[PDB]
């Protein structure tokens, strides 16, 4: 079938390939590239990074027009991303989430419908904080507004209650992914366990006591995340690093995550059905210092999973996609 | 000004900062509390990884915003 082309290792570029395949199989992002819609959104005038979006799009196009075991060489795209993000110059092993962030940032900046970003953070205390969520959202949207954002951007609500005066200070943070701490409590730790750890009430006291501006002093406060706006594509990042003050080690903890019906209603601030199906996983195997990346991806529409391992593309069953090596999870809205 | 940092294991720390603080300076504050070196630290906010040589102001990081602390799985 289609989109089952591999990517040449160019010298430790598995981190880059794994992400490229997760994005290749991101339906709406793929179609954006195949349908050549980025061309409209591109900025006029001589730019340094016009080539990033065009080279990315051309890679995706090549992948999706190739024969079933062709190997594509992303070398020209690499040259573009390393110009944008100098840290990717050369041939050292890197983190694939760091890569995903720099790349989406670069692609987003180049097709941003906002061509000159507007320069005020006023007080919205008279407003129900779902109304202020919306105001914050539209303020964000008048600086960052692209087709990439359409897909990946959600909104966090952070509610910080002073235990003295009871005031609940609310802030709304946009997010392009969520980075989840891993539960220690295992029968087994689940994705839901990690999401509840992220959204639990953090009791802030002692050296963590924030200042309450109503009380005009440092108080014990309770802080809680909830999801105010759910993104079309939900990227979940497992925080697989121990906290060591000397020497960090990778947590290889199996985190059980679902293929289908990831129901996140629990985490909504006051939702309207937010349920996801999995369609890609970037896998890491090794240590914090070194190892290898692969991707498991579900062909859009097709329900068929493949293991993408640099130049090698191989069918797999869904009973093989959940592993300890899962580091990033790509979810899409279900029907 | 206070900001928060969601750390590695589910704990949130509080930082006293100025809008003019550099990301380097913010990383020292995190090292001061968590003993993770700055060159290991990656800080994520509104999808942006925060870069040294820039300030919190650059990133439009307001009071009570949360930075997300992640390290690296190299491969
Ligand atoms: Zn108070």
Can you walk through the features of this model?
The complex is a heterodimer of chains A (335) and B (75). Chain A has one domain: Cathepsin B, Chain A, CATH 3.90.70. Chain A is globular. The longest helix of chain A is centred in the first third of the chain and has 15 residues, at 50-64. In chain A, the strands form five sheets. In chain A, strands 5, 11, 13, 14, 15, 16, 17 and 18 form an eight-stranded mixed sheet that branches. Chain A has nine helices and 18 strands. The relative contact order of chain A is 0.16. In chain A, α2 (27-34) packs across α4 (50-64). In chain A, β14 and β15 form a beta hairpin. Chain A has 335 residues and is α+β, with helices and mostly antiparallel strands. With 75 residues, chain B is an alpha+beta fold. Chain B has a single domain (1-75), classed as Ubiquitin-like (UB roll) (Roll). Chain B has one helix at residues 23-34; strands at 2-6, 12-16, 42-45, 48-49, 66-70. A five-stranded mixed sheet of chain B has the order 2-1-5-3-4, with helices on one face. Chain B is globular and about 35 Å long. The structure holds zinc ion. Zinc ion is lined by residues 162, 164-165, 167, 212, 214-215, 219 of chain A.
As for the CATH topology of chain A, it is Cathepsin B, Chain A
Tell me the span between the first and last alpha carbons of chain A. 24 Å
Beta-strand segment tally of chain B: 5
The best one-word shape of chain B is: globular
- Second CATH tier, the architecture of chain B: Roll
The largest sheet of chain B is: 5 strands, mixed
By CATH, the topology of chain B is: Ubiquitin-like (UB roll)
Helical percentage of chain B: 10-25%
Number of helices of chain B: 1
Number of helices of chain A: 9
- Portion of residues in beta strands of chain B equals 25-35%
Percent strand of chain A equals 25-35%
Enumerate the strands of the largest sheet of chain B in spatial order, edge to edge or round the barrel: 2-1-5-3-4
Question: Over all CA atoms, what is the radius of gyration of chain B?
Answer: 11 Å
Named CATH architecture of chain A: Alpha-Beta Complex
Give the CATH superfamily of chain A.
Cysteine proteinases
CATH level-1 class of chain B: Alpha Beta
Largest interface: A-B, 67 and 36 residues
Helix content of chain A: 25-40%
List cofactors, ions and other ligands.
zinc ion
SSE string of chain A, helix = H, strand = E? EHHHHEHHHHEEEEHEEEEEEEEEEEE
EC number (chain A): 3.4.19.12
Family (chain A): Belongs to the peptidase C19 family. USP2 subfamily.
Domain USP (chain A): 5-334
Active site (chain A): 14, 292
